[PDB]
Design a protein around this nucleic acid. Structure first.
Lengths: 91, 81, 155, 150, 63, 129, 144
RNA sequence: AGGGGAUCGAAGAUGAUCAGAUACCGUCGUAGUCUUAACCAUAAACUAUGCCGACUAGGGAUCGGGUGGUGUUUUUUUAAUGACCCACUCGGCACCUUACGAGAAAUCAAAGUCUUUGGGUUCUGGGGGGAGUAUGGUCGCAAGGCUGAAACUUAAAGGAAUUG
RNA sequence: AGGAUAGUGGCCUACCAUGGUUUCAACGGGUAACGGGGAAUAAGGGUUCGAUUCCGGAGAGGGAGCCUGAGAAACGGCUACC
């Protein structure tokens, strides 16, 4: 059933540590513990081994990603701008 | 003007009114007869063909669809029916 | 009717004040007491040759259809030998010179003589109080198609 | 009109007054019927059958040329689709938009269009399940809909 | 069964029995309706080419 | 959308006579509209009128003889008894002597005058004076 | 148009809509909420006795200028400390504290009339004898 | 909450004016302004004109589509083809003149077809305050939103126009 | 299915099943509510009132129980508690 109205994954903490702090972890913890699509086999099997290590259950390719996500927003835009720099060198 | 015969309007007014706003709505669309000059097959072409239809003989475009009355090919003969 | 474990309860169900003597053996070998409900309500055949008892049946039971006759659609058939019909009608408000669709949910006692379904219009007749909330027995299933013959799925 | 829009266009088809085949027609009722079926054996919409008839041949309106109207003959001839056409292309339209939203999260405009497309689907389905072209309780599940339109 | 509502083996077997009989009544009408579609319309479709252009039109009114 | 064709019909006739047009176009002109105009026409409020018979419920051209003053509808069609019709006439008509209240009845569509004489009543389509 | 359902079977909506809009009255809201019976010095009455406890010189409102010679009467039936006007010339010498007087409404169902602030009652009798008669010197207020 | 954080910039510092000026003005400057994920759910969110339908008046404009033109224009001077023009036409944003009509008028082509009152339907208001307050419920992290009185107080509050 | 009743009936008891009503307003609350015939006002439509001359219900300080009796849960009958 709908076991918790709003706490969700943070409900393991009971009543303690403050609602705002528990809300911040509730955001980053669902994002940390979600399966993620793999960029090489195309199936949602990427898990987080350690902080920043993202191992796909199949094809065993591990990607160095963010601590709590396979791809941070900063890393995404850096990859885009590195591409922008390489296009002007190659064109 | 307070007086006019709606039953008997001028045929010009019928031609100058919307195809459905008129006394009895009737299609302003008609049909064609198109002969491909290279062959001897006739075919009924709707005025608003809406498709690039080819004659049953060969895959030659005899008309081009457009907004309203479909365009007809340059190299063909059309006959109103 | 002539099946479905009629004697499935504790006590033996039988039309009272009748007996079938084992001394004489006839062709039918059985005796079932029925009657015409009345008011031009011809008895359905499944009551004539039935096997259920349903003491409250207008035909095979001890209850008589005397009083009024109602008509309405069926909204729930999900109780034993009793359903609820919604006798929708119109109430005339005198001030506004207008009607309002007001409804009453009438529960009625159905004998197994009738296969009664939701939507199918039925006519019922007042009787001796069957239960706390029931006072009417289904007496004819008003069915040309019954909202089921041409509106339910065909495989 | 346009119950999901403010537009009030009146564009439609104004069929002629005459209730019979025009003088210049050549083919017979069987000839047009046999032409319709093979168009449908290709896997065609009765809307497409009618428009393709109007162009390939001079069949102005198949119901007038025949004694019976288009989808009427197809169900008699055994080509009746599992679900009605206009419902079907609504279903395909709904899944088209729905897959668009999964990839495009921030397309709020298309999200709003989705509920309008579904509103149309549900009102059509409610009507169909009374006429019983659709079996009762035939529900637009929104989950395995793509199975119905491939 | 991974979800609830099969409280024991007998409950599952009695559900299978119902479901099998439900489909086997469904298949009873499926073959029966499929019979009529194959039978009633198609069997007299050859009657058109048989008799409609045979009697009352061509032979008796020919001499 | 369109809910009562006769409502739009007599609303169109009302606008026509107010401007003074001697003829008016009415559509889609159901048979309750024709029966309504028969009642008015025989009494002389309207004259000639033509029912163009197309297969889309048809259209009506009415010749207004400048004699009609106002023809209206009483929607909804109130179920009026044989007795309350006099209350209805007194509320709706500019005077007792003239003017008509149109009723559809078991015996057809007729004014409030021969509704009394036929001793039949029913619903109220509207009025004409 | 007209923004009301004219349909023949719309009676339920008409009555519900009218029954909600009747609450925008002043009289109907008072009658249905019973504000006379609940929150009013008189429990839906017209007259009520009481005791004159002290005298108030109630300065009038603008543009007038006068002392209105009201009396602070507490009503026996509910104890409410209300102010009662004393009509007619004098008539504040005729009454004193710890008398018993009969009050009446002030002519406006609340909403004190004239240039009198907050006094919605006028004294009619005193010592069981009409203050009108006392003003005309027909009777004499007993010392009781 | 994360990134971003150039400009502008609540708060604040400030220098002026001022009788006071922690306001207007000037310099700087925080949150914010930007974005992603969640919220909030209100605005003079206004055309202060619910939505759908018909009819009633004339016009010239313009936008999108369609139609007709041995109409003009473009490498070749009816010979390879769009745009423009004229006449229509549907739909749109509106606009102008008059109001038959309406309205308290201002004004309105709908705010008309409403005391000759009824096309269908939803919502809202019932003098002004008290008061969108209290209370209660509900949604929100909160700011608050939605729903929402009364006592009491008052003879006005207000609209549009006229004269000064 | 039985018990009880003058009889019907979840009226009660056992067993069985999950039913019943609801935005057409159930349920809960308020009533300065006994219901109706009627009263006042009344162009029509209505509004308000209807404790009160008649009909019906309920009560006899408040609940509860019961005898006699055709008829009472009676009260110018009784018993108990308050």
């Amino acid at each position: 059933a709908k076991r918790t109205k709003k706490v969700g994954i943070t409900g393991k903490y009971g009543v303690r540590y403050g609602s705002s702090l528990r809300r911040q972890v509730k955001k980053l913890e669902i994002q940390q513990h979600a399966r993620y699509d793999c960029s090489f086999c195309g199936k949602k099997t990427v898990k987080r081994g350690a902080a920043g290590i993202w191992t796909c259950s199949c094809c065993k390719k591990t990607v160095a990603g963010g601590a709590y996500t396979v791809s941070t927003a900063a890393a995404a835009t850096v990859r885009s701008t590195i591409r922008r720099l390489r296009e002007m060198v190659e064109a | 003007v307070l007086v006019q015969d709606l039953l008997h309007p001028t045929a010009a007014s019928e031609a100058r009114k919307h195809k459905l706003k008129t006394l009895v709505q009737g299609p302003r669309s008609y049909f064609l007869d198109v002969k491909c000059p290279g062959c001897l097959n006739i075919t009924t072409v709707f005025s608003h063909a809406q498709t690039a239809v080819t004659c049953e003989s060969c895959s030659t475009i005899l008309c081009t669809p457009t907004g309203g009355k479909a365009k007809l090919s340059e190299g063909t003969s059309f006959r109103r029916k | 009717s002539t099946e479905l474990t009629v004697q499935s309860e504790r006590a033996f169900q039988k039309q009272p004040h009748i007996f079938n003597n084992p001394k004489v053996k006839t062709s039918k070998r059985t005796k079932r007491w029925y009657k015409n409900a009345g008011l031009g309500f011809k008895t359905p055949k499944t009551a004539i040759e039935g096997s259920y008892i349903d003491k409250k049946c207008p035909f095979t039971g001890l209850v008589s259809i005397r009083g009024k006759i109602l008509t309405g659609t069926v909204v729930s058939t999900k109780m034993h030998r009793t359903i609820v019909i919604r006798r929708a009608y119109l109430h005339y408000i005198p001030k506004y010179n207008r009607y309002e669709k007001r409804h009453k949910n009438v529960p009625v006692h159905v004998s197994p003589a009738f296969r009664v379904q939701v939507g199918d219009i039925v006519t019922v007749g007042q009787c001796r109080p069957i239960s706390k909330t029931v006072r009417f027995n289904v007496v004819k299933v008003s069915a040309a198609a019954g909202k089921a013959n041409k509106q339910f799925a065909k495989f | 009109g346009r119950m999901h829009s403010a537009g009030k266009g009146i564009s439609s088809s104004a069929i002629p007054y005459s209730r019979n085949a025009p003088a210049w027609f050549k083919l017979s009722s069987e000839s047009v019927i046999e032409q319709i079926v093979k168009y449908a054996r290709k896997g065609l919409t009765p809307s497409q059958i009618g428009v393709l008839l109007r162009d390939a041949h001079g069949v102005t309106q198949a119901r007038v040329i025949t004694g019976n109207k288009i989808m009427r003959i197809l169900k008699s001839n055994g080509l009746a689709p599992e679900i009605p056409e206009d419902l079907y292309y609504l279903i395909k339209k709904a899944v088209s938009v729905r897959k668009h939203l999964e990839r495009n999260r921030k397309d709020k405009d298309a999200k709003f269009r989705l509920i309008l497309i579904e509103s149309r689907i549900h009102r059509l389905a409610r009507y169909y399940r009374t006429v019983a072209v659709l079996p009762p309780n035939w529900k637009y599940e929104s989950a395995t809909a793509s199975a119905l339109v491939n | 069964s991974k979800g609830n509502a099969f409280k024991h083996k007998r409950a599952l077997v009695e559900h299978i029995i119902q479901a099998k009989a439900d489909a086997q009544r469904e298949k009873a009408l499926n073959e029966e309706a499929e019979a009529r579609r194959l039978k009633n319309r198609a069997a007299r479709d050859r009657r058109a080419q048989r008799v409609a252009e045979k009697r009352d039109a061509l032979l008796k009114e020919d001499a | 959308t369109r809910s009562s064709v006769l409502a739009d019909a007599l609303n169109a006739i009302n606008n026509a006579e107010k401007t003074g047009k001697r003829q008016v176009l009415i559509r889609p002109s159901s048979k309750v509209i024709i029966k309504f105009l028969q009642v008015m026409q025989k009494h002389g409020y309207i004259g000639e009128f033509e029912y163009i018979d197309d297969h889309r419920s048809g259209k009506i051209v009415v010749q207004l003889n400048g004699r009609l003053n106002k023809c209206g509808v009483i929607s909804p069609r109130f179920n009026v008894k044989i007795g309350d019709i006099e209350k209805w006439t007194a509320n709706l008509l500019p005077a007792r002597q003239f003017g008509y209240v149109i009723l559809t009845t078991s015996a057809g569509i007729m004014d409030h005058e021969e509704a009394r004489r036929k001793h039949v009543s029913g619903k109220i389509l509207g009025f004409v004076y | 148009g007209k923004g009301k359902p004219r349909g023949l079977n719309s009676a339920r909506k008409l009555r519900v809509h009218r029954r909600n809009n009747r609450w925008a009255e002043n009289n109907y809201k008072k009658r249905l909420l019973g504000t006379a019976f609940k929150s009013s010095p008189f429990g839906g009455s017209s007259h009520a006795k009481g005791i004159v406890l002290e005298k108030l010189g109630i300065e009038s409102k603008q543009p007038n200028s006068a002392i209105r010679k009201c009396v602070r009467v507490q009503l026996i039936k509910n104890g409410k400390k209300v102010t009662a006007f004393v009509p007619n010339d004098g008539c504040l010498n005729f009454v004193d504290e710890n008398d018993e007087v009969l009050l009446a409404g002030f002519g406006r169902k609340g909403k004190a009339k004239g240039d009198i602030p907050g006094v919605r009652f006028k004294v009619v009798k005193v010592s069981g004898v009409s203050l009108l008669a006392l003003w005309k010197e027909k009777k004499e207020k007993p010392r009781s």
